[PDB]
């Protein structure tokens, strides 16, 4: 209805938000680090990083952290404003319960925010930002690459038997647990690695056979330039077969090594074919999500308690809540739209969910309080 | 109040914007390159690049450049429209000053845009998009890696003394100026590099000791598969100790090399632990920021001059400005909200800052002109 008192007290809340944001902007960076610790922990250690799209995203993130810190630390102020707004005397034996109201609301919001952070943030960020199936396969592939590297070192030392043994073991382990161009590129890299290892190892005596193997690899590269991947594969197979002649007594062993290389290449291609959705997390989106969660859970823990405390003395009877449930749902949905920075219905519903839950818990608490009062009377 | 003349002249401005955007769309790419030169120059030479998130971001960027070029080159048109809008005769000895008004406003906007570009853009893009502390450390790490590579080449040539000398010097230089898994992976890579260098160098005589070293490395990889990083570190240390036996007279030297490798690995891990915020700049955000800055500074240089020129003849007395200061601040804030594409209060304030500054400079200039006129009279 009227604006005067509402506008004045909204101005009080706004100036409180401004001053507390000014003070909290000093420690914006430590607060941002604390907020980002859960999401970073949920990320893999090898890719524990966040990207920033814009050049002012540091400034935007710091300003958002300051604004949200101000609005969080002004909750006692808005609680006092709300308590003063409704004060018809309230049977002044019951109007003295101001400090209990403000204190209970403040600790309710603080506990909601703390529980949000500690419980929800690590668990949910583990739920979303973790695959646990492609990561295990990637780790298995990295381990297999390490065993292949060890086999190549054994080859470089002139130990064909140990290299073949390791190659067979790795192939068995991989079997127990893709575009043509990509697979051909991987196979070419594997052939180059095997040729380099053989050149380092048996390059003092069998200099005439590695020359033929390298010529066959050159033929493979030529058949890879003009896309004739069948000829490229045939040339790589011939190169490996000739490479097997550097150690005639361990030919099978060398063959096994080549097989492993091919397998690894194939496997890697399969992995890069399977993972068409890589993570690249952003500063502002993650900050917005974390702040939205904390604010939503603070609302969830505060609105029921504030409503119940009003109902103990009586400012909102159950009749008014039942009459205005639909309008309250709508106004909560508009508030969720305002808070959410992204203009999508999905985020609107995700934000409005906590608001509706808080309202429902509040009305349940009010009804329970009224029933207990009636039973006592 | 009425719409007729306002709507007609707004239509004139809109059609002018449309035609100048149509002509300026021809040279959208060179203008975009000129606009992106400062931000690219502020970026490191090794990562002097911009990413585009969407497939139509080229088209969106070109269209935005064309629209903003049209609105920039239509400033004389809107100046003529404004001058014509207020013309009650203006004591027609003073109404003839139309061309001075339009010309002065046009050159004011052009000078504001040029100063914005040349002064602000390089300096501020250097301020934000430059770390200068992690980049120096990264360059030091790259140089240390280069010295380690030179030491490894000296080892590959059979020169253990020179390799040890370089390793000691690099370790001293690094000392003068992290997850367990990542550090173990880096140490494994360093051990592999050292083993490869030793195999290339002393692989003609000490073929029996590098075999034991490679077996110990295999044990390290096994203890790395099942996460037992303590055993992995012990196995790597044993592998390096055995590698030291290839040259018994230079054992310490080889030890030093291994130490350097470990140190480098550790250092690299520390760096990747410290840098949790990598840059990945986008086309549209950077273009929006640059265009916003240029438009804001054009407003800063134009609005005071336009207001002062109106005050010389008199269309806006100081009384009207003092009365409508609050409404003017609000309308400038809504204009800043309209211009800014991102729906955040931070960008709204960042845009509205220049508008308020322009209004304040305009009112100061109007007051100074009035005071000078009163003193003359």
């Amino acid at each position: 209805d009227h604006l005067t008192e509402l506008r004045s007290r909204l101005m009080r809340a706004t100036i409180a938000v401004l001053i507390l944001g000014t003070i909290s902007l000093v420690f914006a960076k430590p607060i941002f680090g604390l907020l980002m610790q859960p999401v970073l922990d949920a990320l893999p250690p090898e890719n524990r990083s966040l990207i920033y799209t814009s050049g002012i995203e540091e400034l935007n993130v710091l300003m958002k952290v300051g604004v949200y810190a101000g609005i969080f630390l002004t909750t006692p102020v808005i609680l006092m404003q709300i308590w003063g707004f409704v004060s018809p005397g309230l049977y002044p034996e019951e109007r003295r319960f101001a400090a209990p109201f403000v204190a209970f609301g403040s600790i309710a919001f603080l506990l909601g925010a703390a529980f949000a952070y500690f419980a929800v943030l690590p668990s949910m960020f583990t739920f979303l930002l973790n695959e646990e199936e492609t990561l295990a396969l990637e780790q298995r592939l990295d381990t297999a690459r390490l065993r292949a590297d060890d086999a190549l070192r054994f080859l470089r030392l002139g130990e064909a038997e140990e290299a073949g043994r390791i190659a067979k073991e790795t192939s068995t382990q991989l079997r127990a647990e893709p575009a043509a161009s990509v697979e051909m590129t991987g196979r070419l890299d594997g052939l180059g690695r095997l040729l380099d290892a053989a050149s380092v190892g048996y390059g003092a005596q069998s200099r005439g056979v590695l020359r033929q193997a390298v010529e066959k690899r050159v033929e493979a590269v030529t058949a890879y330039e003009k896309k004739d991947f069948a000829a490229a594969a045939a040339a790589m197979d011939g190169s490996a077969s000739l490479l097997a002649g550097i150690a005639p007594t361990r030919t099978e062993e060398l063959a096994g090594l080549w097989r492993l290389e091919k397998e690894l290449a194939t496997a890697h291609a399969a992995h890069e074919a399977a993972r068409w959705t890589r993570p690249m997390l952003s500063m502002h989106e993650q900050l917005s999500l974390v702040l939205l969660l904390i604010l939503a859970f603070g609302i969830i823990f505060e609105l029921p308690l504030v409503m119940a405390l009003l109902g103990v003395v009586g400012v909102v009877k159950s009749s008014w809540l039942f009459r205005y449930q639909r309008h309250a749902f709508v106004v909560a949905l508009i508030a969720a739209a305002i808070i959410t920075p992204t203009g999508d219905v999905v985020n609107l519903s995700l934000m409005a969910g906590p608001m509706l839950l808080a309202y429902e818990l509040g009305v349940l608490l009010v009804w329970m309080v009224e029933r207990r009062r009636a039973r006592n009377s | 109040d009425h719409l007729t003349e306002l709507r007609s002249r707004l239509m004139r401005a809109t059609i002018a914007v449309l035609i100048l955007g149509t002509i300026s769309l021809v040279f959208a790419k060179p203008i975009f390159g000129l606009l992106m030169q400062p931000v690219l120059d502020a970026l490191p030479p090794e990562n002097r690049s911009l990413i585009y998130t969407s497939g139509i971001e080229e088209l969106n960027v070109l269209m935005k450049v064309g629209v903003y070029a049209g609105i920039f080159l239509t400033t004389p048109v809107i100046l003529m429209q404004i001058w014509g809008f207020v013309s009650p005769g203006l004591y027609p000895e003073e109404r003839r000053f139309a061309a001075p008004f339009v010309a002065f406003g046009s050159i004011a906007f052009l000078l504001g845009a040029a100063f914005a570009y040349f002064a602000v853009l390089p300096s501020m893009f250097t301020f934000l998009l430059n770390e200068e502390e992690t980049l120096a450390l990264e360059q030091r790490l790259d140089t240390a890696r280069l010295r380690a590579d030179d030491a490894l080449r000296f080892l590959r040539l059979g020169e253990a003394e020179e390799a040890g000398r370089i390793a000691k010097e690099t370790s001293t230089q690094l000392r003068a100026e992290p997850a367990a898994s990542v550090e173990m992976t880096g140490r494994l890579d360093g051990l592999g590099r050292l083993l490869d260098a030793a195999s290339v160098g002393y692989g003609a005589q000490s073929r029996g000791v590098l075999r034991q070293a490679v077996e110990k490395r295999v044990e390290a990889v096994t203890a790395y598969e099942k996460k037992d990083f303590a055993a992995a570190a012990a196995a790597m240390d044993g592998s390096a100790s055995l590698l030291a036996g290839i040259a018994p007279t230079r054992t310490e030297e080889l030890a030093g090399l291994w130490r350097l490798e470990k140190e480098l690995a550790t250092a690299h891990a520390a760096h990747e632990a410290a840098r949790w915020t990598r840059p990945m700049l986008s086309m549209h955000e950077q273009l929006s920021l640059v265009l916003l800055l240029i438009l804001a500074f054009g407003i800063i240089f134009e609005l005071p001059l336009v207001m002062a020129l109106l005050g010389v003849v008199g269309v806006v007395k100081s009384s009207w400005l003092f009365r409508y200061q609050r409404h003017a601040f609000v309308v400038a804030l809504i204009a800043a909200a309209i211009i800014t594409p991102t729906g955040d209060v931070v960008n709204l304030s960042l845009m509205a800052g220049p508008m308020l500054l322009a209004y304040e400079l305009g009112v100061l200039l109007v007051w100074m002109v009035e005071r000078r006129r009163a003193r003359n009279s």
Binding site: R7, G343 | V330, L333
Partner: peptide, 18 residues
């Protein structure tokens, strides 16, 4: 957006005061 709208509304109600 909604944030810009609520900001302009807050400013409009703020300049006039109670």
């Amino acid at each position: 957006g909604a944030g810009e709208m609520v900001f302009i509304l807050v400013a409009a109600l703020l300049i006039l005061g109670p």
